């Protein structure tokens, strides 16, 4: 009776703060399992357990050096074992999961994990394999543009002693051909996809502090109603600043409009700028509709709770918790209808 959620990521396994918002949305907290391997990429919550797709790796770190395959390459991952354990986890059967330690790089003795209330599979190939794609009850993939990704790499990963500035550009240029063919075309399968881009308000500075973000939601998905701005189906450009709400530079901008996303029908939600304070954070959330919120300001309370985390005031985290609440509403409707048939 468990629920499978797929999320693709490039930066790291659990490195994204996306997971911290989702666990907190539907759990008190999430933590690594007690005892066992100190490098276990698994996270355990009351209802949530995060699963690392890096663990289902056919080759150790030593093995891939003697081959042409990258970590993103399909041959390095074995989907045959991954699908077996997930299908066993779906029905409620205990599993044995190997561990890919990022430090040592050698496959460790397998850890066992019990079936969760909600299962999420973080990694790089949730929707790449067609067999696993059916098991997924929800598909998420956040697209990080090369300009903002390179920006994020410099602002956070340049401080390491060994790295040089142009050496970092040499890293993502090597990762681009493998990522473009094997990771990027997963955008069509994703039920909801978040793009991040440099802002158009300020003169295009690539620090990544204030970015431009679009939320693309597939329409027609069961137990899923897309968030809309003032009207479902129309095209709106709204700037919230004015007579009653006054805020400083750079500002805030929104764009709700329908779109065609790889022969699908979607409605996009764009946000460009950042939140200077609380007053426009409620003002923005108040006017949005189909939020799947239990009470007034639930989105604001979850963001202010996690404000110190990176990207909690620029709209990235705002759409992350909005998507996070949607998984909950998807979860509660689905288990209720399953219970009637059960």
């Amino acid at each position: 009776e468990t629920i499978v959620i797929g999320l693709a990521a490039d930066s790291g396994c659990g490195k994204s703060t996306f997971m911290r918002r989702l666990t907190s949305v539907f759990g008190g907290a999430a933590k690594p399992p007690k005892g066992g391997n100190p490098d276990s990429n698994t996270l355990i919550s009351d209802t949530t357990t995060v699963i690392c797709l890096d663990d289902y790796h056919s080759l150790d770190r030593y093995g891939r050096k003697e081959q042409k395959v990258t970590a993103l390459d399909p041959r390095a991952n074995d989907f045959d074992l991954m699908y077996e354990q997930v299908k066993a986890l779906k029905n409620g059967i205990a599993v044995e999961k190997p561990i890919y330690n990022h430090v040592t790089g050698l496959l460790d003795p397998p850890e066992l994990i019990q079936p969760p209330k909600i299962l999420v599979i973080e990694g790089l190939h949730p929707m790449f394999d067609e067999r696993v794609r059916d098991l997924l009850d929800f598909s998420i993939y956040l697209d990080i543009s090369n300009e903002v990704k390179f920006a994020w790499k410099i602002q956070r990963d340049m401080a390491e002693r060994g790295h040089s500035l142009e050496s970092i550009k040499a890293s993502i240029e090597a990762r681009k051909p493998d990522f473009d063919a094997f990771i990027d075309p997963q955008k069509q399968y994703a039920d909801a996809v978040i793009e991040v881009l440099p802002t158009t308000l300020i003169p295009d500075d690539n620090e990544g502090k204030v970015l431009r973000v679009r939320l693309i939601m597939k329409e027609g998905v069961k137990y899923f109603s897309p968030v809309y701005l003032f009207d479902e189906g129309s095209t709106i450009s709204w700037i919230p600043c004015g007579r009653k709400l006054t805020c400083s530079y750079p500002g805030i901008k929104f764009n709700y409009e329908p779109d065609s996303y790889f022969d699908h029908e979607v409605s996009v939600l764009e946000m460009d700028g950042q939140f200077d304070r609380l007053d426009e954070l409620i003002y923005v959330e108040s006017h949005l509709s189909n939020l799947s919120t239990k009470f007034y300001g639930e989105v604001t309370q979850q963001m202010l709770k996690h404000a110190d985390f990176p990207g909690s005031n620029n709209g990235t985290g705002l759409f992350q918790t909005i998507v996070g609440l949607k998984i909950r509403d998807l979860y509660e409707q689905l288990i209720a209808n399953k219970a009637t048939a059960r």
Partner: peptide, 18 residues
């Protein structure tokens, strides 16, 4: 061999970050 060498360096840097 380059994409093999750069893939490791990318994983080590993320490992040092956590």
């Amino acid at each position: 061999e380059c994409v093999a060498a750069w893939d490791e360096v990318e994983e080590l840097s993320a490992a040092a970050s956590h």
